[PDB]
Amino acid sequence: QLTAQQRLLADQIISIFANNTPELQYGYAEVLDDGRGITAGRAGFTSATGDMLEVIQRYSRLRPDNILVPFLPRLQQLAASEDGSIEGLQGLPQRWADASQNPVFRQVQDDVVDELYFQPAMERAAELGAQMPLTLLALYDAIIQHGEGDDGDGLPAMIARTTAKVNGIPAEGVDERRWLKTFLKIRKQVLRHPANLETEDEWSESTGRVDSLMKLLKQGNTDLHPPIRISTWGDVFILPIR
Ligand SMILES: N[C@@H]1[C@@H](O)[C@H](O)[C@@H](CO)O[C@H]1O
């Protein structure tokens, strides 16, 4: 669905949306007061969302004695009830940072990103008949930030509301740039008025990323050809970095 050089490019873009840098932040770990507990890694795995659990479980299977195995029974509890409780979990950000020095841990992160986020976004893009590279990037960024759940703010609901507005999908003859514009605008409205109020501040400050995607659409760079200019937070970046 995406080129190797398009996927490197999309990862560097999405890293700028999330951490203002094109270098993937495997070692990132913060509490953000968004109702999600601790947020970590390249795709922002979360204590509350069952994200951070799948990574550490898989890692513990590859390496049964790692510095993060003691956090595991607390993590199962949070994932169980989607709990944003920062505590139960002291020291974990530092150990997530340290585990990130291991290429194997970083790889588990890649594997979950592909299993939870990239592949499903690509499957959703193919059911849409979507086939501009920019649309794929926007679906992928969106699935990372909003998730693939059943809420009104998840990617499936936004896709459904985009398809309702333009009476159809690109595989059905609706112009794809029109479907994409609508989706980008519906996304910005969800970020600025999320149904889950705990993520309001964290999401309403993130909408510059939707503008950067919108900017590429209006500039006709729907195929993600280089060079790509991203300046989401004020800092300018010419992708791909080399
Ligand atoms: N709000 C986001 C959720 O959207 C996501 O789980 C994560 C990764 O981007 O980080 C947060 O900031």
Give the Å distance between the CA of 36 and the centre of ligand 1. 8
Q: Which of 144, 151, 191, 233 to mutate to test the pocket of ligand 1 (most atoms within 8 A of CB)?
A: 144
Whether 47 is in the pocket of ligand 1, judged by its Cβ within 6 Å, is no
Pick the residue whose CA is nearest to atom 4 on ligand 1: 145
Going by their DSSP bridges, the two strands 38-40 and 237-239 should be labelled as unpaired
- 174 CA distance to ligand 1 middle (Å): 31
The first and second tokens of residue 114, run together, are: 């592909």
Distance 43 CA to ligand 1 centre (A): 8
Query: Which residues make beta-bridge pairs with 30?
Result: 39
Give the Å distance between the CA of 44 and the centre of ligand 1. 6
What is the rounded CA–CA span in Å between residue 148 and residue 125? 13
Number of Cβ atoms within 10 Å of the Cβ of 72: 13
Under 8 Å between Cβ of 40 and 52? yes
Ligand 1 atom at minimal distance to the Cα of residue 32: 12
Q: How remote is the CA of residue 173 from the centroid of ligand 1, in Å?
A: 33
Residue type, position 149, single letter: G
What is the C-alpha to C-alpha distance for residues 120 and 56, in angstroms, rounded to an integer?
Answer: 21
- Pocket test of ligand 1: the residue of 36, 49, 54 to mutate, having most ligand atoms within 8 Å of its CB, is 36
Asked whether 226 and 239 are in contact (CB, 8 A), the reply is yes
Intra-chain end-to-end CA distance of the chain, in Å: 23
E strands present in the chain = 29-31, 38-40, 45-46, 228-230, 237-239
Q: How far is the CA of 122 from the centre of ligand 1 (A)?
A: 19
Here the tokens at position 95 are: 């150990």
Q: Which two tokens stand for residue 96?
A: 């997530």
| DSSP designation for 191 | H
Nearest CA to ligand 1 atom 8: 44
CA dihedral defined by 202, 205, 210, 214, rounded to 10 degrees? 170
Q: Under a CB-based contact definition with an 8 Å cutoff, are residues 140 and 120 in contact?
A: no
| Contact (Cβ atoms closer than 8 angstroms) between residue 100 and residue 106 | yes
CB 162 within 8 A of CB 183: yes
What was the resolution (in A) of this experimentally determined structure?
2.4
